[PDB]
Structure 1
Amino acid sequence: CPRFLKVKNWETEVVLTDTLHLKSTLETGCTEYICMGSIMHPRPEDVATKDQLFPLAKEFIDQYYSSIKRFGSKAHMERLEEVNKEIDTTSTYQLKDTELIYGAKHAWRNASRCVGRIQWSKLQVFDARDCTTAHGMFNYICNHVKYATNKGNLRSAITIFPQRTDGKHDFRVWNSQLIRYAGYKQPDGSTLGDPANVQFTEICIQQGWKPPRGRFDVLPLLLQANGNDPELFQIPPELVLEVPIRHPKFEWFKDLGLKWYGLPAVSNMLLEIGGLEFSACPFSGWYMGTEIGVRDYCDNSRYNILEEVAKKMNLDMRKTSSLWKDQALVEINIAVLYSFQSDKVTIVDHHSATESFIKHMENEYRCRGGCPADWVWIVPPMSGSITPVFHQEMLNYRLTPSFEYQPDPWNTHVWK
């Protein structure tokens, strides 16, 4: 592979030079003959062997002591020797708190699909590696939610549960996000709530959950500690900050009865650091408007409200070339930003977030020699070309530490 790769911004003519790609550790899925850049997702109870683990650990440890300007130091070599000893005797090792914090911040930093990474170094890391039970997990998660929510003044946070051992003792949050609304399939084929969540909702209901059967019912947490069967907990409602959607102009918009939750928090991903696998590592930030206004509300397979809004806007909905869909999409997204700003809950519009990302990316090319980015994910789902990211060439590659996808636990769990 070539040492220097160049990306261009076609709006500004600015050209950046990437050398960081050379540190690429994993596979994109693409080859020279095919590109899989728009594929969403391109192993049994299986864990890293001693020989696989040594080099991955050294790689990470080197990188860490390089970052604190102590590469090749006595404390660097001693840490190498201590880790290598731990792998030899125990087939694994434990990260120091300093290294855990570095690794988490870097996994976010390396997350090519995140437009919010300007904030990567401000991340509160809760070390939950002493957790042993589902109730314990519940406690840690509640604390995360409250801290991150901060009464509306959101703060990004991640809570890391114990790493994987033999693969039969995994900690998992079964929820894909900490806060989601339930979906219920009706006998008639209609759906109530969020149609996307019918499967998970069914699982909950089976585990003992009593469903309110509403449009915006917060799901319980389904928590798995040390490989045991998962257990249900209801998040205390006072910890779940919500925002009712209203529009600065349309008085009738509040009559749609829409609202959304303040905190975006992903909990189905796997954090890999130095070859160690943290299968439960919920992390949370704050919303970009379009996540709600466009995808949650206007995806056909989600809440699908374009039609209903278009009707209350009295738009001609017979031709598509009237662009009634597009007009209603903008208004919805205006109401979302306005409802969040009015309740003083943190939210960033897609224009501000993308400009910030460009400034971030440029800084990263300057200080780091690169910034992996997934254009398909970074460009917002509305108004794409009037945001600066659309015109920015990006290179995508996988650096470690990283957040990775993992199988859904209900497909793999062995029931006790």
Structure 2
Amino acid sequence: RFLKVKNWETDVVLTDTLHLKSTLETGCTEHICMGSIMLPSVATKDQLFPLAKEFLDQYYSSIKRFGSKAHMDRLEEVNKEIESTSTYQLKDTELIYGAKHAWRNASRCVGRIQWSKLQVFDARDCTTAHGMFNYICNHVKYATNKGNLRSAITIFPQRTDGKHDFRVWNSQLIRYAGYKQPDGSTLGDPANVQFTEICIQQGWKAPRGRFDVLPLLLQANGNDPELFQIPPELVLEVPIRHPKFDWFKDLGLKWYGLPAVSNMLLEIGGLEFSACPFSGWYMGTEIGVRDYCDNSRYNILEEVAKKMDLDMRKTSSLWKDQALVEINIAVLYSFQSDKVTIVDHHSATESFIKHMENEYRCRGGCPADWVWIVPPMSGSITPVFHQEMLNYRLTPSFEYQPDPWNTHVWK
């Protein structure tokens, strides 16, 4: 019941008891495991007080005043507001706690060692898409911090009826555009081609190039979303060069500094925040391996292989592997030489093991998704490969939600 997880590099073992506080479900049964399924599987007032109660109890436990007069009255108070409004409102304190802990509990995040250093921007007074643009802009500018990136989150008004949702329709605040071609192939980011057509559908005038920064599509209080372009001076980009291969610049690649997921759902005390964009800094691989070398993304192994002169006739020459290592030395070097915050897959996976050590110490566990924690290259020469990890769902939590253009009632 109180399980053991081992590291097969270090022979270290840690006992996980935190999984007893697990509430949600995984998709695995006693007879099947789904830990490589990517995305497995209104809210009334009866269900809402249990969730509020459990959240308020761990928050008051947290500040070392478990069950004091404050906790008692704040429970009675929240119950009364759930009778009255069939919902309730978080204190600013409770919002910042819930947000930091949704991160803390994000089992697919390797960077969680920083979970307590998180800047929460309360945008629950927002009422318009224009006010969303403004709140998002100061988030970008603050978290970019002249390349010295800072972790942040901007939390928009919580969901109420369900047809009055605040949604950023973008999947990340800053992404490059996707255009297919007359000949069928694709310029820019093939991941984004449907979205880019939607922005163009709403009148975005496309500069039909490669690294075209998409505009924000912002829906406020359930209304039809509206286009706003982040001022370019606020979008920091890093030009990729190599420390050795001076033909690297001719490749003409570049990436934005700021990873900022905008399409997910934040859950606190059973209250649901449909718009909650959050940013940190990049681990090198997401750019070098996934963005640049996914077959369905930028797909540059083709060219980098050529300009090195590699044996591309044979699959077993590992020309793909060699060209992948060079690409990731260049992303890191480019980011580091401009003092833009970035972490390399060795330094970040080592911190996660350290973070894991602390979590099992002062919390009794650490949800973790091995399928996602292992970097997408050099797997077993990173220590997380060798670390058994228990996955389970704690709350407060970040959750996936459907793309808004499949649900939205539109006119």
Q: Normalization by structure 2: what TM-score?
A: 0.99
CA-to-partner distance for each residue in 1:336-392, whole Å, 9 max, x for gaps?
000000011000000000000000001000000000000000000000000000000
CA-to-partner distance for each residue in 1:5-51, whole Å, 9 max, x for gaps?
000000000000000000101010000010000000xxxxx921111
Three-state SS of the structure 1 residue aligned to 2:73 is helix
Compute the displacement of 1:140 (Å): 0.2
Three-state SS of the structure 2 residue aligned to 1:184 is strand
Aligned to 1:63: 58
Compute the displacement of 1:188 (Å): 1.4
CA distance in 2, matches of 1:47, 1:144: 30
CA distance in 2, matches of 1:70, 1:259: 50
* Structure 2 residues without counterparts, runs of 5 or longer: none
CA-to-partner distance for each residue in 1:147-204, whole Å, 9 max, x for gaps?
0000000000000000000000000000000000001011211111011100000000
Aligned to 1:189: 184
Aligned to 2:396: 401
Alignment coverage as a number of residue pairs: 409
CA distance in 2, matches of 1:91, 1:208: 40
RMSD across aligned positions (CA)? 0.9
Q: Which runs of 4+ in 1 moved over 4 A?
A: none
CA distance in 2, matches of 1:405, 1:299: 22
CA distance in 2, matches of 1:67, 1:85: 23
Compute the displacement of 1:320 (Å): 1.2
CA distance in 2, matches of 1:50, 1:180: 38
The correspondence of residues 385-400 of structure 1 with structure 2, limited to 5 A, is 385-400=380-395
Aligned to 1:30: 28
CA distance in 2, matches of 1:384, 1:38: 16
CA distance in 1, matches of 2:101, 2:191: 31
CA-to-partner distance for each residue in 1:234-286, whole Å, 9 max, x for gaps?
00000000001000000000000100000000000000000000000000000
CA distance in 1, matches of 2:224, 2:189: 26
Aligned to 1:301: 296
User: Please, which of 362, 366, 372 is the counterpart of residue 361 of structure 2?
Assistant: 366
The correspondence of residues 2-401 of structure 1 with structure 2, limited to 5 A, is 3-40=1-38, 47-401=42-396
Aligned to 1:43: none
CA distance in 1, matches of 2:353, 2:198: 41
Three-state SS of the structure 2 residue aligned to 1:69 is coil
CA distance in 2, matches of 1:273, 1:167: 17
Compute the displacement of 1:300 (Å): 0.6
Q: Normalization by structure 1: what TM-score?
A: 0.98
Three-state SS of the structure 2 residue aligned to 1:321 is helix
CA distance in 2, matches of 1:324, 1:190: 24
CA distance in 2, matches of 1:355, 1:188: 45
CA-to-partner distance for each residue in 1:302-347, whole Å, 9 max, x for gaps?
0000010000000010111110000000000000000000011000
CA-to-partner distance for each residue in 1:190-223, whole Å, 9 max, x for gaps?
1110111000000000001000000000000000
CA distance in 2, matches of 1:192, 1:401: 39
* Structure 1 residues without counterparts, runs of 5 or longer: 41-45
CA distance in 1, matches of 2:164, 2:185: 39
CA distance in 1, matches of 2:55, 2:323: 48
CA distance in 2, matches of 1:232, 1:5: 50
CA distance in 1, matches of 2:404, 2:398: 17
